[PDB]
């Protein structure tokens, strides 16, 4: 959706594009020529440089502050017209449902994951966010490997390599006997 909003950016810039193949290139920029900052309004007022991206063709494609302006929506969901509270506050709500003692652990135990989370000072900006959210004397600690994708793949590579895992998996014939509701009991 952020990339689609970047296609909106394109039309505002004048880039007349509406294909999914073009969308792929936008995602290539997203992972490539798109970062984060920590100052929203400050850098918004700050004059940009309009980073000229170059196509496989090599066409000049200026960016501006849009590269980090579009992920502000991830923290400001109403920019797309969607009521939510932003990643930070939603996680804080998850914290609210936990307990004060366990909360401190979770401040120290933050597992950022997902490739979408790969940005310049992504977690650092989010650190500042939660620092403005969490109270004083709260030590927030993030854990976010460089493989925030394969962490799941390697975790499944380990879990799948278990012997107790027999009960964890579901046999073929089992589902073939009665149904998936048995596995829905197994999924919780």
């Amino acid at each position: 959706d952020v990339s689609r909003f970047l296609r909106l950016y394109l039309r505002k810039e004048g880039y007349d594009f509406h294909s999914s193949s073009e969308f792929e290139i936008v995602k290539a920029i997203k992972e490539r020529a798109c970062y984060l900052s920590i100052n929203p309004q400050k850098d918004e007022t700050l004059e940009t440089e309009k980073a000229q991206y170059y196509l496989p063709d090599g066409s000049t494609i200026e960016i501006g502050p849009s590269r980090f302006r579009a992920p502000e929506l991830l923290f400001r969901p109403d920019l797309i017209g969607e009521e939510s509270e932003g990643i930070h506050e939603v996680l804080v709500f998850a914290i609210q449902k936990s307990d004060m003692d366990l909360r401190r652990t979770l401040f120290s135990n933050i597992v950022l994951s997902g490739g979408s989370t790969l940005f310049k000072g992504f977690g650092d900006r989010l650190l500042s966010e939660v620092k403005k959210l969490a109270p004083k004397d709260v030590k927030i600690r993030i854990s976010a490997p460089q493989e925030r994708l394969y962490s799941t793949w390697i975790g499944g590579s380990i879990l799948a390599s278990l012997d107790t895992f027999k009960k964890m998996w579901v046999s073929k014939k089992e589902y073939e006997e009665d149904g998936a509701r048995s596995i829905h009991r197994k999924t919780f």
Partner: protein, 75 residues
Amino acid sequence: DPKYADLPGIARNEPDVYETSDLPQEELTSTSVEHIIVNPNAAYDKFKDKRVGTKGLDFSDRIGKTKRTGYESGE
């Protein structure tokens, strides 16, 4: 004409400009359109008196206080 008189080789009886005697919407008529006039002065005087207040209706890539609304003030 005087040139015609003074020039011997120039013959006459010529209908000079020889010519050929030549001899000489639905969309509104549909089963569902309702083309209506708003009565420009009537609706104009109607909405005209309806004052509109504005206070810096500013939006273009402006970051700070996510929700915004045009014609901010009241009148």
